[PDB]
Design a protein around this ligand. Structure first.
Ligand SMILES: [Zn+2]
Lengths: 61, 62
DNA sequence: TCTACCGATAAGCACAACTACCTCTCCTAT
RNA sequence: AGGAGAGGUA
DNA sequence: ATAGGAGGTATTGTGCTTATCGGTAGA
């Protein structure tokens, strides 16, 4: 579909969706952004007072 | 989606004025002047002829 | 002097965290 | 036919 | 019948039932 010609665009997609989904079993599947804590910043918590260094790839916290 | 005929509000025949409206818009005419040139004194017909969207072209192409 | 129960401090264990509802999608290992 | 998971109504 | 190492993390919230933990009161 990407970088298709003018003739190929006429037959096929309805030109209403930009194509952000997946086709698994005939049903469209869309990912939802997951909010995650930053692993490249020093994190300080309370009760108890502590500072932790996150791990990038290997568990070296 | 072709132009809705009979102009549901107040019941005015506007089914044959879409081509003339497009021709007027093709020239150096604004929407108000083009609608006034079609002899429309009520704002219902002007709303009907201004809010319409041409969708049948995409249906034919796709 | 040695028995004899006798209230406190943690450590788990068990329900409770709403009605009437309406659709869609997916599911049954190897 | 029974379930599990999501989006929803008053 | 077999298979599904090992990781610092990042639900509360009320009742209930222990254990244990010293702890004095009596002979
Ligand atoms: Zn009218």
């Amino acid at each position: 579909t990407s970088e298709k010609g003018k003739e190929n665009c006429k037959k096929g997609d309805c030109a209403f969706d930009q194509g952000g989904y997946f086709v698994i079993k005939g049903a469209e599947k869309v990912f939802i952004a997951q909010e995650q804590m930053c692993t490249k910043r020093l994190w300080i918590s309370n009760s108890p007072w502590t500072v932790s260094f996150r791990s990038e790839n290997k568990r070296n916290r | 989606m072709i132009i809705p005929v009979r102009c549901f509000t107040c019941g005015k025949v506007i089914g044959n004025k879409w081509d003339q409206y497009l021709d007027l818009l093709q020239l150096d005419y604004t929407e108000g002047d083009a609608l006034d040139a079609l002899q429309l004194v009520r704002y219902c017909c002007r709303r009907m002829l201004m809010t319409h969207v041409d969708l049948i072209e995409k249906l034919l192409n796709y």
